[PDB]
Amino acid sequence: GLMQFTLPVRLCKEIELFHFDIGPFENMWPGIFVYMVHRSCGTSCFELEKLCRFIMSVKKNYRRVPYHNWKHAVTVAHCMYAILQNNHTLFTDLERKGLLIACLCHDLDHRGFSNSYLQKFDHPLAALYSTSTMEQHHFSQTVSILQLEGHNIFSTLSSSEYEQVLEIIRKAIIATDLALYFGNRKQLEEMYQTGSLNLNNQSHRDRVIGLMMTACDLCSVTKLWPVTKLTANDIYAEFWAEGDEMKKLGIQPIPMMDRDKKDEVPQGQLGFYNAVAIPCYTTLTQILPPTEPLLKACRDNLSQWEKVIRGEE
Ligand SMILES: Cc1cnc(CSc2nc3cc4c(cc3[nH]2)CCO4)c(C)c1Cl
Numbered sequence: 001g002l003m004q005f006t007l008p009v010r011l012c013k014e015i016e017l018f019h020f021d022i023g024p025f026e027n028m029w030p031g032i033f034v035y036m037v038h039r040s041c042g043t044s045c046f047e048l049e050k051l052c053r054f055i056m057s058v059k060k061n062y063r064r065v066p067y068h069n070w071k072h073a074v075t076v077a078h079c080m081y082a083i084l085q086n087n088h089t090l091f092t093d094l095e096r097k098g099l100l101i102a103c104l105c106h107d108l109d110h111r112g113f114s115n116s117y118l119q120k121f122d123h124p125l126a127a128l129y130s131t132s133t134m135e136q137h138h139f140s141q142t143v144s145i146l147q148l149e150g151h152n153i154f155s156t157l158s159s160s161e162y163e164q165v166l167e168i169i170r171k172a173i174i175a176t177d178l179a180l181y182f183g184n185r186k187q188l189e190e191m192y193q194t195g196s197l198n199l200n201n202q203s204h205r206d207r208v209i210g211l212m213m214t215a216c217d218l219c220s221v222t223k224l225w226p227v228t229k230l231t232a233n234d235i236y237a238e239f240w241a242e243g244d245e246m247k248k249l250g251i252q253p254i255p256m257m258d259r260d261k262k263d264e265v266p267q268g269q270l271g272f273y274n275a276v277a278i279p280c281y282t283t284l285t286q287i288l289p290p291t292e293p294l295l296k297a298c299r300d301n302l303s304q305w306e307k308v309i310r311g312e313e
């Protein structure tokens with residue numbers, strides 16, 4: 001009960017910042033997460049024994065893929081932690097509990113392949129789940145782990161609170177399907193501009209949480225340039241393997257996944273910043289003003305990608 005997690009001084013300070021990098025020491029990532037749960041939620045939100053066993057089971061169910069790995073899970077949870085800490089009073093007790101767990105679990109058992117690749121391969125998961133294939137799998141895996149003996153971190157919620165938090169986690173994880181982001185952000189853009197946005201409207205909160213999940217999921221573009229650039233290597237290491245597997249099915253992959261078009265990556269990054277990232281953090285900054293540092297970091301990184309194209313790096 002009186003057992004806090006404490007971090008070294010540099011981590012204690014930098015972990016509060018949006019652009020924090022969790023570092024290369026894997027063995028510290030569980031403690032970093034628990035630290036964030038304690039400060040975000042309370043030392044009482046979860047039984048420490050149950051939380052630690054849940055964390056280690058989640059870690060085991062992430063695979064050794066270049067990008068959609070355990071480090072990504074913790075990185076996405078930290079971005080959510082920074083959003084929640086900078087918006088203290090906007091979120092319920094259940095929402096703070098649910099969203100950190102949703103983020104940690106959002107890519108459970110990822111194989112390093114898009115929904116598109118599963119559908120073209122005719123993977124069994126594509127028959128079980130026709131849309132948001134991997135994201136329905138990720139939520140399915142989250143429920144499985146919660147149902148292991150000694151792993152139900154929500155046991156002390158009432159029946160209705162338990163149903164609410166699982167519903168928050170499900171929507172949150174489904175919302176990480178980037179195919180759904182475009183429509184979600186358009187709707188939020190209209191609602192904010194016509195002034196109809198209402199955070200007491202549950203359907204509106206869902207949309208806002210969805211955008212928070214996209215923002216946390218893409219947060220690689222909101223780090224300092226050296227982190228952003230080195231993470232892009234891991235992202236493309238996965239995409240180019242998928243591209244290779246497309247060519248094995250006799251399908252030319254999209255240029256994003258074709259390692260033969262490495263040269264066009266800087267231009268490809270521009271389109272991504274302009275079509276996805278900047279719009280995402282702009283709408284998020286409009287709804288939640290204290291998340292502006294994410295939009296500022298993203299704009300800085302767009303500027304660095306423009307400099308790569310102009311041969312200045
Ligand atoms: C965080 C993040 C950062 N970067 C990306 C890559 S976005 C992207 N990279 C590309 C490279 C390309 C083309 C299109 C691209 N779109 C055509 C020629 O080569 C993603 C998908 C994410 Cl999720």
Ligand SMILES: [Mg+2]
Nearest residue numbers: 106107134176
């Ligand atoms: Mg995902």
Ligand SMILES: [Zn+2]
Nearest residue numbers: 106107176217
């Ligand atoms: Zn993800």
